[PDB]
């Protein structure tokens, strides 16, 4: 065949830390369908927002928003435990159906997005050009986000170990752990990946007695 219908830009959702995670790649032939399981970013989360994005940038905010919806009634559970199946399906007429379903509770929500939505030919070409012109910056942002998400979880896991250990943790040690938690917290707000990893290292270096308990 010398012609066919494709979806012209990647399609996906926003995931933890402000990144676009792709479910259908640019230039995929239509009709097509893809599903992927996701989970919750923090402990006890009862809801997620599925923000539907079109484009090639790694920052969710730099992509075209096609719509959004919430899924709620998830039983509050530890981060990473809920199994939320997200499905993008584009039919032969370019209509995009997105659904999210929480496996445990069975709760599901969906939206339908018309084929005329999204970026036009000029904006499609500008998106591919802008993505390439910013390829290194976007790679650096993705790595930063990965590191931030790891430190964010190290803040939460460490703090709970402090709780559980209670009196079994020497006051000297709680002191040093507390200050390193605050320094990690501050670093996570910045954009320097090595600074964050360094505060993670400093925190490990005062958590050894906590490690053993």
């Amino acid at each position: 065949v010398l012609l066919l219908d494709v979806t012209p830009l990647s399609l996906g959702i926003e995931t933890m830390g402000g990144v676009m995670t792709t479910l259908i790649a640019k230039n995929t032939t239509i009709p097509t369908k893809h599903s992927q399981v996701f989970s919750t970013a923090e402990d006890n989360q009862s809801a997620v927002t599925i923000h539907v994005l079109q484009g090639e940038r790694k920052r969710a905010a730099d992509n075209k928003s096609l719509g959004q919806f919430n899924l709620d009634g998830i039983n509050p559970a530890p981060r990473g435990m809920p199994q939320i199946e997200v499905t993008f399906d584009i039919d032969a007429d370019g209509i995009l159906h997105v659904s999210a379903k929480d496996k445990n509770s069975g709760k599901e929500q969906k939206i339908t997005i018309k084929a005329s939505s999204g970026l036009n030919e000029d904006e499609i070409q500008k998106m591919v050009r802008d993505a390439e012109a910013n390829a290194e910056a976007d790679r650096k942002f993705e790595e930063l986000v990965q590191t931030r998400n790891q430190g964010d979880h190290l803040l939460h896991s460490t703090r709970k170990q402090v709780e559980e250990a209670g009196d079994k943790l020497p006051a000297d040690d709680k002191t040093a752990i507390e200050s390193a938690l605050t320094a990690l917290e501050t670093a996570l707000k910045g954009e320097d990946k090595a600074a964050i990893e360094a505060k993670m290292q400093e925190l490990a270096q005062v958590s050894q007695k906590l490690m053993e308990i």
Partner: peptide
């Protein structure tokens, strides 16, 4: 496995 934030 990616994670989705709350609304």
């Amino acid at each position: 496995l990616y994670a989705i934030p709350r609304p």
